[PDB]
Amino acid sequence: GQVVADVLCEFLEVAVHLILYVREVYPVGIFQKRKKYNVPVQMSCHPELNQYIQDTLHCVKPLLEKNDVEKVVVVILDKEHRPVEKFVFEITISSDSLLSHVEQLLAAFILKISVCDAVLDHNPPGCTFTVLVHTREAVIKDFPWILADEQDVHMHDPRLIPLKTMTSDILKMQLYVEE
């Protein structure tokens, strides 16, 4: 329960950073490698951006603790505050031996965002982002949450981009065991 919310919150935070990096929402100069993970990770060093992402997700954490969260969407906007890109994380077993659970979610997402880096055109300059939280059917000081408008939700003709990983193309891997 608690542990799942914690794993997901950590993952989601790093994920926000890697989206901002790969998509150049902010200048590459604010990003640095984190050797705290045994998977490659770029994260912002910009203290106020980091505080912002952290506050956001630590508001989301209590809802994850009780499975009230249907999805978390990281939305990339031009500064017309139109959604131009939507990273949807739907919220719906393995050993720690090579990768921690957090690192496994990171590896999977890194495989996806790397394809992303190749299929998607560059975004216009001056893009920003926000996070949308999608609760299921049925905190912090001066960090309130409002109801989203339907301007930063819907798109003129959204295109689902299947981010099919490298391996998926190259290799299919199957395990057969005895009796």
Binding site: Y26, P27, I30, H46, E48, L49, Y52, D55, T56, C59, E70, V73, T128, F129, T130, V131, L132, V133, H134, T135, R136, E137, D142, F143, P144, W145, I146, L147, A148, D152, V153
Partner: peptide, 13 residues
């Protein structure tokens, strides 16, 4: 169900 977002926008840089 919302959706909900932070009132305060992401910082600038």
């Amino acid at each position: 169900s919302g959706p909900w977002k932070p009132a305060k926008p992401a910082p600038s840089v």
